[PDB]
């Protein structure tokens, strides 16, 4: 059949903010994950429920690639059962997650020496996001009891902050792209498979 769109998710120029993680429907393809192994020295390739090696000899019902750039000191939060600003308010994976997390350094691409403010992260929210949830809103978060409006104030602040990634910052503060391939393998019909 037709090859799988593993391009446009790894070879993309810019990825998306964490609060606007994009999902790409991957169906009716022959998933040849071998093109990822020789892509770059990933910092993390933790697969839950499946082994990275024994991955091209199976089929999946519908796989979704979640792309988003996170900070280095919070890459441990993109995993099952984790907690934190990004885990609770931006992107939360379920405890029963069955997929692979692919993280690698992107300081050479997503980090300008003047500040890449095009990547934002949600810091304040009145409730924690549920698994596979997105919040693209930009409403001012009321921390105090005083009413608020469309303008910031001493007690209601903006919900989205900017990660000022710079090449001079040390490890942990550098940008780290993430590709969370969510698998769902069961008796359901198979739309994507490996190279036989």
């Amino acid at each position, epitope marked *: 059949t037709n090859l799988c769109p593993f*391009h*446009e*998710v790894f*070879n*993309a*120029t*810019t*990825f*998306a903010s964490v609060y606007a993680w*994009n999902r*790409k429907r991957i169906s009716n393809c022959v998933a040849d994950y071998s093109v990822i192994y020789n892509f770059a020295p990933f910092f993390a390739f933790k697969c839950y429920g499946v082994s990275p090696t024994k991955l091209n000899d199976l089929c999946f019902t519908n796989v979704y*690639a979640d*792309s988003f750039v996170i900070r280095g000191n919070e890459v441990s939060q993109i995993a099952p059962g984790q907690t934190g600003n990004i885990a609770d308010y931006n992107y939360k994976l379920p405890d029963d997650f069955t997929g692979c997390v692919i993280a690698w350094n992107s300081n*050479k*691409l*997503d*980090s*300008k*020496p*003047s500040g890449n403010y095009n990547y934002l992260y949600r810091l304040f929210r009145k409730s924690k996001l549920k698994p596979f949830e997105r919040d693209i809103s930009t409403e001012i978060y009321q921390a105090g009891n005083r009413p608020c409006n469309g303008v910031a104030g001493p007690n209601c602040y903006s919900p989205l902050q900017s990660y000022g990634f710079r*090449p001079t910052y040390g490890v942990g503060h550098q940008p780290y792209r993430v590709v969370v391939l969510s698998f769902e393998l069961l008796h359901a019909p198979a739309t994507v498979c490996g190279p036989k």
Partner: antibody
Amino acid sequence: QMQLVQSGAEVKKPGESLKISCKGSGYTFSYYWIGWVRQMPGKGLEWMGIIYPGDSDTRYSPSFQGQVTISADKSISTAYLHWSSLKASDTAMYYCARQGDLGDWILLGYWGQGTLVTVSS
Amino acid sequence: SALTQPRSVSGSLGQSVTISCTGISSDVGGDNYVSWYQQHPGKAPKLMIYDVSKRPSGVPDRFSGSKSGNTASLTISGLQADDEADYYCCSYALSRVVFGGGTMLTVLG
């Protein structure tokens, strides 16, 4: 001020394996990408590749995967084009470009003067 | 993919002109990876449009752009003799930049 000068004209014959250079100044030649663009007589621009002076990470175009290699000497802030076994088709004005502080890492913001390479006999 | 660009275009001073760039790509993270470059005879390219919803610094405000599906456009709100140069569109969505064939604008005056 931010400047980006290239080597002078290089008239060469097939097989001499010349090298073009681009001397950058006015910025940190370690965090900004640097590449080259080809423009044959009368035709349009053609991208060849870029290199990150920090680490030897070179991204080439499918049409220039092995026809030419890009290198950068971070100690002197210079990028080079190394041709091996030149051909008569390599005649073109090669322009250097760098990232820029405006857009994405791949967007060419600032350009150079361009070096004319003539492969004739 | 490959971008196509009408080799030749025309216009009149004080009026406007449009350039078509078909073949724009797309990736996971954005779809506005379109930029335009100007190049006079015997000079180097000069970026004039990046992030089509945005403009560079120092470029006149009459160089605005619009996007329409897999096609982008460049509008010169007021043609002048200094605009008689080639224009190349670029698509840098898939980490590989692709230039067009150029559009030679011949202003009439």
